[PDB]
Design a protein around this ligand. Structure first.
Ligand code: 42C
Ligand code: 42C
Lengths: 208, 208
């Protein structure tokens, strides 16, 4: 069933910094997420070039944005490469120990938080707006897994079976109470237009 | 007693755009109001090199920011050139030397509300965050006056005797009920250091 792991101490730290530093520009989290999703989609397109079959698990390459106001969650969904259990656990297949260190080191010298994505660590900006993040992922070489954390220094990984999702990754944001603006359709289009306007993949925003 | 005026049509339209356009990046109002005070100050500093009895109503050339959570107001005070009765009506109530027209056409052709200062009408960015605005002002050549407007197409002007200020202008923003972040010390410092760090007069954030 559920394994719990500790974050490496540096990811714990950075996670803490994002949760606790006063920084009004919280919206940059979306860009960061949209920008992990594109990269993920680049990787599967890349691999399929030489191996057509990698798209048996789905030929469609795209990003959906799914707000749900009852659940108070904003789900960012791609049909990219996905993550094996190992990737999930490996920070997130991100180079996070070094990326974090450099990053905090750049934050000494006049970097502000929005540059997070420059360090391979954009993903953790989800915590600018989210109290808990669930990540569902399917990679072609592996089962479907749910990773999850409310920060606090730990994560869980369990296998996930309720709806097979084909191939790719769902990052579910359970929003903090004072951050429900990011479920508003005009708030979300405004963001995508302002930070993600030209991106190599179709972005669909679901309606309620 | 109290005189009531109509905004010149275009200004009425523009104030309507500021109030009604969906636009999340409201924090720039502070930048525009500060930069307005600084032009005021430049002016009195300039005028006073050829006539120094003009500083007779106050030598300090500074900007104050006074939040007040009871009244729900943020007030920007400068000890600048002030306005006469006439300057209030023309400068606040009519196109005057502003690029109102070019600003409104610009937003038609892709520009955005943050670029408002580029057109000399950035004072109306007050209406991003305020439901009502009162300007108390005092020029070396005139009485002290209160101008006021909750938009809806008109403004008032009366003499203001409760409270002589020497020389300059206070802009008091009665903040919308959901715009009270701009009363927070931490929020105010963030904004000034982001948009106003190079202003060339002391900017004092008063404490509550
Ligand atoms: C951040 N990260 C490690 C990711 N890896 C693979 N697919 C993803 N889709 C969103 N984020 C993804
Ligand atoms: C808006 N406007 C025309 C202004 N005129 C003179 N002094 C000012 N201080 C802040 N705004 C001012």
């Amino acid at each position: 069933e559920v394994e719990t792991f500790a974050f490496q101490a540096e990811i714990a730290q950075l996670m803490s910094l994002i949760i606790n530093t006063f920084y009004s520009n919280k919206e940059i989290f979306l860009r960061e997420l949209i920008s992990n999703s594109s990269d993920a989609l680049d990787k599967i397109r890349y691999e399929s070039l030489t191996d057509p079959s990698k798209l048996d698990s789905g030929k469609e390459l795209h990003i959906n944005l799914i707000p749900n106001k009852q659940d108070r969650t904003l789900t960012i969904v791609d049909t990219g490469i996905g993550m094996t259990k190992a990737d999930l656990i490996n920070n997130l297949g991100t180079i996070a120990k070094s990326g974090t260190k450099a990053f905090m080191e750049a934050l000494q010298a006049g970097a502000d938080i929005s540059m997070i994505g420059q360090f391979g660590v954009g993903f953790y900006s989800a915590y600018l707006v989210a109290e808990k993040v669930t990540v569902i992922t399917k990679h072609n070489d592996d089962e479907q897994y749910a990773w999850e954390s409310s920060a606090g220094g730990s994560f869980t990984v369990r296998t996930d079976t309720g709806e097979p999702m084909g191939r790719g990754t769902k990052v579910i944001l359970h929003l903090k109470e004072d951050q429900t603006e990011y479920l508003e359709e005009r708030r979300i289009k405004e963001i995508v237009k302002k930070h993600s306007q030209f991106i190599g993949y179709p972005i669909t925003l679901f309606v309620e």
